[PDB]
Amino acid sequence: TMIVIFVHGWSVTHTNTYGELPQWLENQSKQGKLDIQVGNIYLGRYISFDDTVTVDDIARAFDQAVRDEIADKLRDGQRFACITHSTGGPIVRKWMDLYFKNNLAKCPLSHLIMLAPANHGSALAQLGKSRLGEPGKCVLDWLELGSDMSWQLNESWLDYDCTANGVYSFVLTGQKIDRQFYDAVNSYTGESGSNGVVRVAATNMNYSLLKLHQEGDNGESLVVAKMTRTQPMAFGVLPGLSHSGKNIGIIRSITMANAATHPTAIWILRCLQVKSRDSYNKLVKELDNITKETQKNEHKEFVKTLVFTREYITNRYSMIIFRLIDDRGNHLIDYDLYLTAGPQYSEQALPAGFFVDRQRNLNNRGKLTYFLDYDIMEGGINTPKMQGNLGFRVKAYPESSDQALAYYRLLDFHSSLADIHKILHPNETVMVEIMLQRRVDRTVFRISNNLTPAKISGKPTGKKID
Amino acid sequence: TMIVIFVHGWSVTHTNTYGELPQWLENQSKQGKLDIQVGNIYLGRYISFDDTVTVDDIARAFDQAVRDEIADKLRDGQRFACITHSTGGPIVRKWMDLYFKNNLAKCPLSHLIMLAPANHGSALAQLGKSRLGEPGKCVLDWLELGSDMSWQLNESWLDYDCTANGVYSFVLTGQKIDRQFYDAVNSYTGESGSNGVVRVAATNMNYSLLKLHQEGGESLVVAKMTRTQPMAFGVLPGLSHSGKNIGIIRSITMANAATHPTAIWILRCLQVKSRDSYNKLVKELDNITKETQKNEHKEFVKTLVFTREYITNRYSMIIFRLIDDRGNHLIDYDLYLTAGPQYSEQALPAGFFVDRQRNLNNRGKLTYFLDYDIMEGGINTPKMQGNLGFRVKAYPESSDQALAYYRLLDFHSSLADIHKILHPNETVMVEIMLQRRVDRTVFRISNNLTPAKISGKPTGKKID
Amino acid sequence: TMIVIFVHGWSVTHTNTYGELPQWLENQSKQGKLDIQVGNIYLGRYISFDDTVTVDDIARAFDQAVRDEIADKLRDGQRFACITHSTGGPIVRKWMDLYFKNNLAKCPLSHLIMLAPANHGSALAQLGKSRLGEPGKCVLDWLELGSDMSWQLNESWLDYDCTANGVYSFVLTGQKIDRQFYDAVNSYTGESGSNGVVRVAATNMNYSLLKLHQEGDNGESLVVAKMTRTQPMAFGVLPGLSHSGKNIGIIRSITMANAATHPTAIWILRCLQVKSRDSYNKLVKELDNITKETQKNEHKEFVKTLVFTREYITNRYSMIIFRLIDDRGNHLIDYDLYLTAGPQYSEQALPAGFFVDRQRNLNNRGKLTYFLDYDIMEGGINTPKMQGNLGFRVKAYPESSDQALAYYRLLDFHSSLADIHKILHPNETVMVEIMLQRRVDRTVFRISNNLTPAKISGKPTGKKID
Amino acid sequence: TMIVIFVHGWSVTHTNTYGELPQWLENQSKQGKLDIQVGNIYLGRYISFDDTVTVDDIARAFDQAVRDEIADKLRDGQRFACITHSTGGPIVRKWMDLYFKNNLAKCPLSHLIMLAPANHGSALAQLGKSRLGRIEPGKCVLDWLELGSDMSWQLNESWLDYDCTANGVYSFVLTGQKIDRQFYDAVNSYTGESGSNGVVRVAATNMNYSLLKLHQEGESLVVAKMTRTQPMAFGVLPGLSHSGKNIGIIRSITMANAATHPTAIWILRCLQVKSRDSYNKLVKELDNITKETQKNEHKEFVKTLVFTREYITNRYSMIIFRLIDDRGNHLIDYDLYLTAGPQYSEQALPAGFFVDRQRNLNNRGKLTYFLDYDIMEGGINTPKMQGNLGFRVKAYPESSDQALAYYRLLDFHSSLADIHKILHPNETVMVEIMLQRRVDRTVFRISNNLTPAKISGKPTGKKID
Ligand SMILES: NC(=S)c1ccc[n+]([C@@H]2O[C@H](COP(=O)([O-])OP(=O)(O)OC[C@H]3O[C@@H](n4cnc5c(N)ncnc54)[C@H](O)[C@@H]3O)[C@@H](O)[C@H]2O)c1
Ligand SMILES: NC(=S)c1ccc[n+]([C@@H]2O[C@H](COP(=O)([O-])OP(=O)(O)OC[C@H]3O[C@@H](n4cnc5c(N)ncnc54)[C@H](O)[C@@H]3O)[C@@H](O)[C@H]2O)c1
Ligand SMILES: NC(=S)c1ccc[n+]([C@@H]2O[C@H](COP(=O)([O-])OP(=O)(O)OC[C@H]3O[C@@H](n4cnc5c(N)ncnc54)[C@H](O)[C@@H]3O)[C@@H](O)[C@H]2O)c1
C-alpha cells in the first residue's frame, strides 16, 4: 500500500497551500482508484522563513520527520509518494542525494511528483528578502540562479536513474501568469515562459551538462567538448495554471468541487498509478503531447479591460547557466561571454528577439544565466543563409602577456541547431562549464648564474610555462 | 656536486636583495669548503609586484625556470640547494608540494635553507597593497594571517619527512628590529617577537595541528594533535628582516661574511650530508636560539633626547579555524582563552596578549599572538594549577534564537606537562568543529488533514 | 573679434578628436564668413584618464589655461566661443558656475556650442572604469545617471539667463548609432534615442525641475507641486550623426572635403554668427524644424547584410531623474516608485512599450532614472478611455507604525499628458524631487509622573509628533 | 517651582535604570530640601532599540512629550531640570539645539544635569548591534555615538557658541571612572578601558572642549584658530561605574544609601543652584572633587583567591581629527603623526602615551586618538624635550608625479608647556585640518597650434590658482 506526503514551497506559513487535494486523494482512495489507507496521507510543514535554516538543514529534518512518524509503516514494507510544490522538489531531491544517492533501490520513496519545482532556481531569489516579502536568506542563496549549491545537486543528479531503481519521478508545471498578482516594479512576476515564479525550463529535470575545456600548445586554442544528459523524466506543461493562488495556482486552486476537471488533480492521479517502466513511459509520452498542446494553445493571450486590451505572446524558452573556471581551481570573475551565429559565427548575427533575460549570481560572479527564446532562435538560425550555426565566444581577462603575466586566451566554440547533438532544447536548461587554460608567462620566475645584481624586469618573454 | 639557487622575498625589484652572499659562497667553494663548480650558483628572480600572479603561478614558474636552465645538470646527477628569503620559503615549499609531495626522494632539491620565511604568514599583509607600498594582491591573500591557502599548504606539510627522503631543510631567522625603519602609524613594523616583517613563531616549521571536534544533551570534545617532523630552527643574533645594516641576508658583504651569523650558519647547513650531521646542527642551532633570546631580552636605545627600554620575550601564535560538521566556516562566534582552577576567561596572566587579527577573506580564521613566557610564568603556579583552555560560543546559540544553532564548546588543557598546545617560538593550528544542531520543528509531517498555520516554535529536540 | 576654443570629451588621448573642423573654421574666417584672426582658434586638451581628477578640478584648470594663454587678448576686449564635445559641455558649464554664476555679463565667453553634451549624464558611466575601457573614476561619478554632482550643477542652471546676458548657448546632437561599434554585451551602445553614448534627452538644456512635497497631519496625505524650467536654449538633433568615429561622429567625421556639406559644420557656422536676441531666436526655431525633420526621417532604419536584414525603430524619448528625500534631510533608499495611468491612476495601465530603461545610482540609492518612449506614452494615454492621465505613486519604507516607530505615508501625484502643464516632453529630461514627511510616533518619547518603575513598551500610540 | 524630568541611556528597557533616585528626591522635597511639588517628578522613557529611530527623531519626540504632559505647568511659569544618563545628555542637547539654539533664555529647561553622558561618543558603538547586545541598540543611534561621528561633530560644533549660564540655564556634567569588574567582556577590552567607566571615557563626557582649526596656506604654512566652549561644571565622582546596581552612577542609588551616595549628594547641590555665583562656587567644588578622585583612584589592587591585579588609571585626552580640503572633500587616504622633541619627530613621543585609536566607519576622514595626558605631559615638559608637541599630516596623492591632483604635507608645531596648549586632562579636543588641493596646470591646456597631437599627461610642476 501507498503513503502520500505533501511538501510545500518557500515563504509558506499555512498548510492550506495544498488546496483541497489531500482530502480529494483520500476520497479517490475510498473509490478504489488508489490504495491509500485512511490515515496514510500526510501534510509536511517546514520552516522557510528562518534566515539560519539551509536546504541541507531542511532535507536532514525531513529524514527525521519521516522516521518520527512512519518508521513502523516503512518497516512493514510501505513506500511513500511525495507530492512537492516549488522548493519542495529540490529539498526532496537533496534528501535523496544525502541518504540514498548510490542506492536508490532502498529509498522508501516510490513516486516523486514535483509541481512547478525550482529545480534550476528562480530569477526572483536575487531580489532578496526585503523586496521578496519573508524568505530565509540561506534558502534564497540556494534558489538564486547560478547558485553553487543547485549546480552541485543537479550535477549529482546527472548520474541518477530513478526509473531503473523503481522510483517514478515526474515534473508538472504551468506557464500561466495570474495577472492580478503582477508586481509592476518587478517584471519577473509576469515573465513569459514562467508561471510568475519559476521558468518552465527551470522546472525540467531533462537537462544536459556541456563541458568545454580549452587545450593548446604553442600556437592556437582548441576546444574539447563533452555532453552528458540526465535520464528521461516525465515532464508536463499543464494548461491554465500559475504558481500560486486560489484562482489558478497549480495546487492552491484545487477544490473538492473542481478537482475532477482540474489538470493537476487529474494527472497526479495518473502519476501515482504508475507501477512499471511500461506505464511510466506511456505517461511520459502522454505528458509530452499535453505539453505541445498547452504551449500552442497558450501562445497568444488577449486580456481585455474597460480601458485597454493587451496581447501577450508566449513561445518556448531555453535557459543557459554558464560556469567559467580555469584549470587551477579558479572561478573567473572578469570576462565577456558572447553568443555567436551565422556563417561566420558573429556576435552580431543572433536573431532579433532571441533574448529574454540575463542574471549574474551575486555570490559567484563566474555564474551567469541567460534566458532565451528558443523558437525565435531556431527560426532565425535554421535558414539557408544562417546555416544552423550557433556558438559561444569567451574572452576572459587579463587577455595577454602585455596586460598581465598571468592571462587567458579567447575560447571559441562552434555548434549547430540543425542536428540532434544541439545544446539548446525548448523548455530545458543547459549547464555549460567552460574551463580556460591559465597561461603564465615565463618571466614570472627566471634563474641566472650571472651573479652581478640587477633590476628585475617584468617584461614578458611571450612564452608560457608548462 | 652542488648547485645553489637564491630565491628572494616579496616586493623585491633588484637581485642585490641577496647582498654579497652569492659571491661569498662562490669564494668559499674555491677554498674547498663547498663543492660548487664555478657557474653553479644561480640568482632567482620572480615577479611579486603583479596583482594577477598567484603563489601557485610562481611555484609553477619555478619548475619551468629550473628546467629551462639546469635540466641537463639535473639529469647528470646534480642536485640544488635553495636559499630563500621571506616569501621565497613558502614558494619553494609550494613547488615541492605541487610536484613532489608523494615522492620527495625524487625531488632534485637536496637542501632548503629558509631565511626569515613567512611560513605562517605576515601580520603586515592585511594592511594591504596601498599602505604597504607595491606588493601583489594575490600574494598578500596568501601571506595574510589565517589565509586558507597557507593553512592548506601547512596542513599538507604535516605529512612530510624531508630528512627521511634526503632533503635537509632549515629555518634561520632573527628578532632584531631595525629601528630606523619603524613606521610610527603601523606598529607591526616594530613588534616584539618579530624582525619587523615576520614573527619568529611564524617562521618555524615545527608546529602542531590540534583538532577539537564536538560530540554528544551533554557537550563533549575529542582532541587530536599531529605535529610536523623536526626541522632545524635557529634564531640568530642581531638580525632584522631587510636592509643593509642588519638585514638577515641583505647586510652580508665580502668583508663581514666571515663574522656574519647568516653566512656562518648557511655554510654549516650546506655541509650537512647525513641524518647525523643534520641532527648535530639541529641541536647547535637550538642552543644558539636559547642564547640569542636571553641576550636580546632587554635592549636599551639612548638618543640625545630620551632612552627607550625594549623587552623581548618568546611568543606563541595560534591560528584558529572554526567550522561545523556540515561544511560551513563559522563567522559569528566569541573565542575565549581560559585559565586558573575554574577555567575562567578572567584569569589569564596579565600581559599574556600581544595581538589578534581576523582574516578579511574568511572570518572563521582568527590569529592570536601571545607572550609565552608571561603565560607559562603565570599559569604554572600552585594557585593556577597549570590550567589553560579554550571556550568557543558560536551563534546562534539556542533553539529560541534560531532553529539551527550551536552548543558551547569547552576544551581543558595544561601548560604543565609535555602534551601542551603552546610552545615558545611556535605557531599552533587549532581547528574546532562544532555540531550544527537543527531543531525538529524545521520539518514535521502529520496525517491531520485539517489545514493550519505552521508554527516555528522549537520542540527542544534536535534531529539526528 | 572672436576667439574659438575647442573642448573635447572623456577618454580622449589625441586632439584629432576634433576632426578637421578647426582648420576649416580658419578658412571660413579667411573667406569673410567669421571674424577670427589667424591664431585665434585654440585646441583645448584636458586629462580625462586620471582617477584623482574631478570635474571641479578640470573647470578650475580651464580658468587657469585661459588666463595663461589669452589673458592679454581678453583684456583688449576679445571674447571667445567654446565648441565642446561630450563631457566638455558639462565642464564649461561648471566653469561658468564656479566663476560667473551671478554675473554672466562679465563672463568672457560669448558663445557656447555643445556637441552631444552629457548634460544629464550617460547611462554607460555606471558600467564603470574596467568595462568602459581608461576613464577617470571621479569623472564617471559625475557622468553617472542620477549623480548628485550633475543634479547640483543643473539645479543651479535653472536660474541662468544666458541670452539676457549676451551669452548665446546651443546644444547640437545626433541620434544615429554607428552600428560598426555596437558592443553586444552592453546594449546601451546601441540604445534607441541615443547616439551610442548620450541620450538625446540627456543633452537638452531645456528641462524642468518638479518639486512634490508631502503635507498632511493625521488623516489625509496631500501634495504641493512646484515646477521650474530653464530658459529656452537652442536645441537641434542633426541627421545621420553618432557620438564618435571618423564614419559619422558628430565632430570626428568632419573633413575639409566634406565640411561644406556636413550638418555639424554648417550649423556651427550659423551659431557662431548669432549676434543678437533676434538672430538667436531665429536659429532656435530653425533648429527645432531640423529636429522635427531628422526624427521623422530616422524613425525607421533598415540594415541589410548578406545574411539578414534588421529593422530599427527610433521614436522620441523622455528621461526622468527621481530624487527621493524627506523633510529631515535624509535621502530615501528603501522605496517602490510607480508610474500610474488610466482613469483610476493604476500602475497596471501604462501603454505597452512605454519603457526603455531604468538605472539606480550606485553612490546615492535615492536617485533613480527612468527612460521612456514619449510617443508610445502620449499615444496611449491621450485617448478617450485613458483620459490623458499620468501620475506617480511612491511607497517608502517603513510604511506604518506597526513596522517602525519612524515611517512614511504613501504619496500619490496625479497629472495629465493632455495639458500644456505636462511633466514629460519629447527629447527632454525632467528632474523630479519628491520630499516625504517623516512621521514619528509619540511612543518614541513619553514622560510620566508615575514613579513606579516599569518596563518600557514600544507599542505605537497611532498618533504622530509635531 | 521646579519640575524634574529623568532621561535614560541607550539599550534601556525598564525605568528602574534610574535606581531609587526619583523617589528619594520626592522624599527630600517633602522635607524642605527642594521645592518640588508632589507630582512634579517625571520619568522619561524613549525607544533606543528601534533601528529606524534617530537622535533627531528622539529629540523631536521629547519636545512633544513635554508639551503633551506639562504644557499647562510651563505656561504657568514652571521650568524643569533634566537629569540625564548616558545618551540622554546628547539627546537633550540636541533638543535644545533644534528648538532653542539662539534663544536659550526662552528654553523651559533651567538645569541640565548630565550623568556619564556620551557627549563625544562611545568607543563601543563601532562594535555594532549584534556584538553589543551580547555584552539590541538601534543602528541609527549607534551612528550618532560612534567615535568621530559626523552627527556628534555637528552638534558639538554648534555648542561652541552656547552660553547656558548667561541665559539662566545651569548645566553640569558628573561622571565616574570606576570599572565594575564583574561586567568585563574579555573579548571587548573597551569594557574595562582605563580612563572610562566601562562605556564612556571621562574625556568624552566633558563639555569643556576646544575646536582647533588648522588651515594650510601657500612652502606650506599653517593658520591656526582655537575656539573653546564656555565653562561648564565638571566633576569626576569617586567609586562609580556607568551601569549596574553595584556601583552604577545612577543605577546603584537606593533610599537607604542615597544620603551618602556621591551622585545624590551632588545632584542635590546642582539643583539648588540659582545664580551665577552659586554656579561658579559649585564649579570649583566639583573640580576639587575631580582632583581628589583621580588621585585616590590612580592605583587599584584587585585581590582574588588565585591572583592579584594592579590597575593604573591616569588622566587622558581625546583628539577627534577631521581631515578635509578647500574644495569640500573629506580626505580618506592619509597618514597622521603626532610629533615631539626638539625636532618634532614622530619617533619621540613619550613611551606609553597611547591608549587607543579608532577610525569612523561612515567617514574615513574621522580619526579618534585616546592618549595618556599625564604620561604625555611628564615626558614632553622636560628640558631635553622642550615641551614640544605637534601634528604632521601626509595626505595622498602627495606629488604631481603620483597624480595631477595632490596634497602637500602639513606640519603644525605646538607646545604643552604654555597656557595655549591643545591637550587638557579629562578633555576632548576637535582638530579640523584643511589641506590645499593642488591641481597641476597640465589638467587643462589650450594651444593655437592646430596640428593634432597626442595629449601628454606629464605634469608641469606648477599648480593652478
Ligand atoms: N526586477 C525584476 S523582476 C527584473 C526583471 C528583469 C530582469 N531583471 C534582472 O535581475 C537583476 C536584478 O534586478 P533589479 O534589482 O530589479 O535590477 P535593476 O537594474 O532593474 O534595478 C536596480 C535597482 O533599482 C531599483 N529600482 C528600479 N526601478 C525602481 C522603481 N520603480 N522603484 C524603486 N526602486 C526601483 C531596484 O529595486 C534595484 O534595487 C538584474 O540583472 C536585472 O537586469 C530583474
Ligand atoms: N597597523 C598596525 S602595524 C597594527 C598593529 C597592531 C595591531 N594591528 C591589528 O591589525 C589590524 C589592522 O590594523 P589597522 O588597519 O591599522 O587597524 P586600526 O584599528 O588600528 O586602524 C583603523 C584604520 O584607521 C587608520 N588609522 C589609524 N591610525 C591612523 C593614523 N595615525 N593616520 C592615518 N590613519 C590611521 C588605519 O590605517 C586603518 O585604516 C587590526 O586587527 C589591528 O588591531 C595593526
Ligand atoms: N549593460 C548595458 S549596456 C545595459 C543595457 C540596458 C540596461 N542596463 C542597466 O544598467 C545597469 C548596469 O548594467 P549591467 O551591469 O550590464 O547589468 P546586468 O544585470 O545586465 O548584468 C549584471 C552583471 O552581469 C554581467 N554580464 C551580463 N551578461 C554578460 C555577458 N554576456 N558576458 C559577461 N558578463 C555579463 C554584467 O557585466 C554585470 O556585471 C543595470 O541597471 C541594467 O539593467 C545595462
Ligand SMILES: NC(=S)c1ccc[n+]([C@@H]2O[C@H](COP(=O)([O-])OP(=O)(O)OC[C@H]3O[C@@H](n4cnc5c(N)ncnc54)[C@H](O)[C@@H]3O)[C@@H](O)[C@H]2O)c1
Ligand atoms: N574590541 C575592543 S573592546 C577594542 C579594544 C581596543 C581597541 N579597539 C579598536 O576598535 C576597533 C574595532 O575593534 P574590534 O572589532 O575588536 O577589532 P579587532 O581588530 O581587535 O578584531 C577584528 C575582528 O576579530 C574579531 N575577534 C577578535 N578577537 C576575537 C575573539 N577572541 N573571539 C571572536 N572574535 C574575535 C572581532 O570581533 C572583530 O570582528 C579597532 O580599531 C580596534 O583596534 C577595540
